[PDB]
Amino acid sequence: TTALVCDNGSGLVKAGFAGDDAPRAVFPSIVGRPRHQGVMVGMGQKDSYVGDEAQSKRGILTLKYPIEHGIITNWDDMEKIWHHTFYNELRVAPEEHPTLLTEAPLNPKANREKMTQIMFETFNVPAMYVAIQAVLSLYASGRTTGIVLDSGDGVTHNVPIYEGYALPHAIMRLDLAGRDLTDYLMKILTERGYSFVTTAEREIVRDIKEKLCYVALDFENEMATAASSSSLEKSYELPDGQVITIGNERFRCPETLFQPSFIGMESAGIHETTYNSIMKCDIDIRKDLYANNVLSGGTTMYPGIADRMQKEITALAPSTMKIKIIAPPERKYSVWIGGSILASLSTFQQMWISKQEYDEAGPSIVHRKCF
Amino acid sequence: TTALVCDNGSGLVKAGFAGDDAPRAVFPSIVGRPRHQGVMVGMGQKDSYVGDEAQSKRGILTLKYPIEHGIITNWDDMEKIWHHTFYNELRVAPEEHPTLLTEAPLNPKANREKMTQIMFETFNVPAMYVAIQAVLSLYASGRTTGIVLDSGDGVTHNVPIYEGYALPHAIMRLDLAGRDLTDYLMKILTERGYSFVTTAEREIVRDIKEKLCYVALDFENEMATAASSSSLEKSYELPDGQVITIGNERFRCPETLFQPSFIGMESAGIHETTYNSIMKCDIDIRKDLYANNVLSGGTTMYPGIADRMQKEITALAPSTMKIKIIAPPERKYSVWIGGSILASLSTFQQMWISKQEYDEAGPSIVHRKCF
Amino acid sequence: RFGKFIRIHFGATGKLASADIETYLLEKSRVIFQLKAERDYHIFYQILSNKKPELLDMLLITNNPYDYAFISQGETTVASIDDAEELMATDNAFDVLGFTSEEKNSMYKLTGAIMHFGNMKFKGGGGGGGAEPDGTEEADKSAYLMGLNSADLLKGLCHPRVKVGNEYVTKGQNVQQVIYATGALAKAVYERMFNWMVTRINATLETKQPRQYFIGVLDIAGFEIFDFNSFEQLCINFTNEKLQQFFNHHMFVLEQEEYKKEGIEWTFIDFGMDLQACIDLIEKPMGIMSILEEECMFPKATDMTFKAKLFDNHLGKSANFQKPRNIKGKPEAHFSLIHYAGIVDYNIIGWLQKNKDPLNETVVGLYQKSSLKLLSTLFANYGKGKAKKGSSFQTVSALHRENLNKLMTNLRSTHPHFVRCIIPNETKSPGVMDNPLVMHQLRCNGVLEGIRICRKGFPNRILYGDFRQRYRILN
Ligand SMILES: Nc1ncnc2c1ncn2[C@@H]1O[C@H](COP(=O)(O)OP(=O)(O)O)[C@@H](O)[C@H]1O
Ligand SMILES: Nc1ncnc2c1ncn2[C@@H]1O[C@H](COP(=O)(O)OP(=O)(O)O)[C@@H](O)[C@H]1O
Ligand SMILES: [Mg+2]
Ligand SMILES: [Mg+2]
């Protein structure tokens, strides 16, 4: 048989059969509802547009993400997402296919328990397993040590692993992610005279953020260059014309990662959190962790982010320690690749949670030692 | 049984059976009364001439229009019009034929309430329904999106529809219509030497407007050409002789639509109201509305109006959008065709307001979801 | 395909008088649309026979069937029957018939004209929505064939005229609408040709004897079943199901008559509604046929929307509509219905495009004005004020239903008798049998339904004399 590797994540569901090189179906994780009444009769509009279809009907729909920060807040919407993924994007019945799910560290136990219950009850999958989004990313990089920084759309976290032994006391989680960057970009774009309020145009602002924003190696020098010259301004074409030009805002949006105080958060920057995590571990493995930094998640796709992170960590770290940052081109899909690799392992076939086991011992099986 | 589609409109009542390709009966909505005494004894002239017959006796009657701008102002005259339509034109008993009626947007609720009360009580129609002009016009055009500009003899309104969903906050209405154009043509003909005052001559002026007026692509250039050249002058034959020649007055009457300031109206031209309505809607559907602009109504039948509208909108709209205007040859009867199509649908049979529902919920039942 | 019917009349003294022939339920979809592994009517293939070069050269017919569009879509040719001698025999039979050879030339040239409508092409206007023709050589030769004017025909196709109130106005047509109109015109002209041929044959066969009570003979297509059932198969199955329901009602009436004759009367429940439950899901409003008819009218209908509407309106709500089933890697299945012959699945794809039959009025008027015999076939086509049906509002499904009704209102007026023919084997070898073929024949013939209806009551009835002489030794 074959195993399904579903990665719910947040803002992007990617899924595909285990053993494939790349995920087969990737689409945004949104649920759209019509906010108008409809005058034409006989069309028979559906009451809920789910997945990529909602992206084509943004102008007559209100879009809601079922996942705020890793956790699921609207279970009906998530069930709709899962049903659409299983029956439309993949067109494969889950009755005879084990499933591998991924979630971030340090999440409420009720979330995992309810996910397992829904998957065993509604879809009746033969078996399922849950993994951390960081260990799979480490698998996908062909490594066995180092720290992994998984900066997704909902949550960011750092997980140090040495020789396959995780260190729970050094795992760090920060709620700043791509969604907050998009909100900040919407907020600061007002100073230039552009107003974005509707949820539909939040997607537009996300598109500008993806296409134009970049990370500055140095902040003050870039601010001075932008204030003096105008070579950094770039123009973007909106869906209805009226091209808009953005300058200094181009690199202010991604700086929030290193400067959380822009959005009011008291927590330290990404580099400082990584550095603190590095020293939170023992002293005999700090060199390898320094030399095996791993990045994953869409938010880490900004141009020039790797250089800035390396410079900051080198400034913080002792001079006599070599610092290297691994930034493969496929950061976004690294987690799914790692999950597919893990599912293809022969030794993993005994770690599945059988339906009979769940029925006998109840939903709390996942938390028990039969992880 | 079969459904009956009647369109009161304004200045022209058009009715027929559902499923037909064109209305069977089309005639002016005029009620005439004799203003003289009458000396011959025995002929027994009737006290009221209704419909097209009043045109034959136009010279001895005081023609009155029962409706000014969509709103009915003389209910007895409207009852006479409906009776003539049902009996002397279609020769059918409304006791066994559901009736579909057409009504313009943004009108007093008492209008619809009285219309339904008259239909249910006076004529005892088994069931009836009321629809909006814009939706029917879009139905007849074979489209599901776009902004439709319906300009009849009473009122000109723009309604944007996207994927069968209306945008009520973007619906625009303007009282400028064909009747105002005829009045302005009367006002502007007097400067040449021809005076038309009596209501009978209203029809002559309207016929001249229909037969000779046209829309100029450029106003200043055409005025300059007419100031020197005499190639724009055309002659018309009155019903008694003394042909009248008109020069620049032919293309100045329809300019009121784009230049309402001629007749003192504060609002802007139709070309500007359409653009404002488009910009009212959401940003994600503006391209489709631009590319699916629809025209309907008799007043939009002037030659060259489509090109002028396209030029104006292209000037207003961004240069990176393709502006396309759809002007089918049968603009005048588009609404009735749409009504016939709507009535011929099978799923529409459960949306009729049955007699029992009206009796139980009273005349107000019109304002429920059966809009 | 067509439902041939023959009424054999008799004289007053119970002697043979004369015969009458009628046709019903002729399928028009086969003319334009053909399945991949199936052919069209034998007429076109027979006409392309090379043994008569005079017709090919005087009709300017391309001898290559591949070039033409209507025929090349389906299977080009099979070794079914040698068309040469069959065509020769048909021509000889026509020659020995009552009418002359000019009429035969007329049918041949009209068939050739039907053949060339596929070469028409249209290009959307650069500055306008309306689409105008690009090539005209095919149009020119066709108009020459019918004796019409190419320019007038092109204007009519592009700009149909319609009467509104008391004045004529021109309507705009796009590429899709004009293509549908051309297809509808071809189908309608072919149907009228066939009807006129049937009437001529009936007139020739007619003799001057009085027409007293008649004996009907009805031949119809069976309950055909495929792994790729489509709209035509749906219509055939619906007609067969209606016929079976009639048979069930007749048998029930006979059973009640026998019961009242014998005084053994129980279980008065009629045996009709049980099968009529499926019928009510097809012809009645909100049925599959009505939903399809409405959907083809909607300007933006698509197959997915049609399937969604069917599922919303029938899954769980009806007792006969259910999900499809996938076996042995069947190519596709969208929905499955339960009939008297078992479970049958149909394919939605392609139904919407072929359901439309929008005729053009101005083209019919031009035909009536023609200088050829064609005007006779198109002689008539479309104080109380009854309302007719719009050209655009014309679908094949409705006509079928109407035809079936006008058949049932006639066949129900006579006492029916049933004859069943069963093929013993697929091969020509006598004696040998293929059990699955016999099972399929029995299932499609409704014999199982008869036995099931009989078993629920008391099918075994024996006289007291026989029962005594055979079973009295027991006690
Ligand atoms: N090249 C890029 N530039 C800027 N932002 C990006 C880029 N690629 C992805 N993103 C951001 O990453 C987010 C997607 O994160 P994702 O990896 O899907 O998280 P999860 O795995 O939790 O769904 C998007 O919201 C997007 O804004
Ligand atoms: N060919 C034409 N050119 C200019 N104006 C026309 C033409 N035909 C009709 N009209 C105008 O259109 C008006 C009729 O509008 P109509 O379609 O009846 O509106 P409604 O549908 O509200 O009744 C007439 O008053 C006439 O002045
Ligand atoms: Mg993620
Ligand atoms: Mg109107």
UniProtKB/Swiss-Prot annotation, chain C:
Residues covered by the Myosin motor domain: 1-475
Organism: Homo sapiens (Human)
Localization annotation: Cytoplasm, Myofibril; Cytoplasm, Myofibril, Sarcomere
Residues of the full protein shown: 243 to 726 of 1935
Official protein name in the record: Myosin-7
Recorded domain comment: The rodlike tail sequence is highly repetitive, showing cycles of a 28-residue repeat pattern composed of 4 heptapeptides, characteristic for alpha-helical coiled coils.
Note: The cardiac alpha isoform is a 'fast' ATPase myosin, while the beta isoform is a 'slow' ATPase.
Record-stated family: Belongs to the TRAFAC class myosin-kinesin ATPase superfamily. Myosin family.
Region annotated Actin-binding, chain positions: 404-426
Modified residue annotations for Phosphothreonine: 136
Spans traversing the lipid bilayer: none
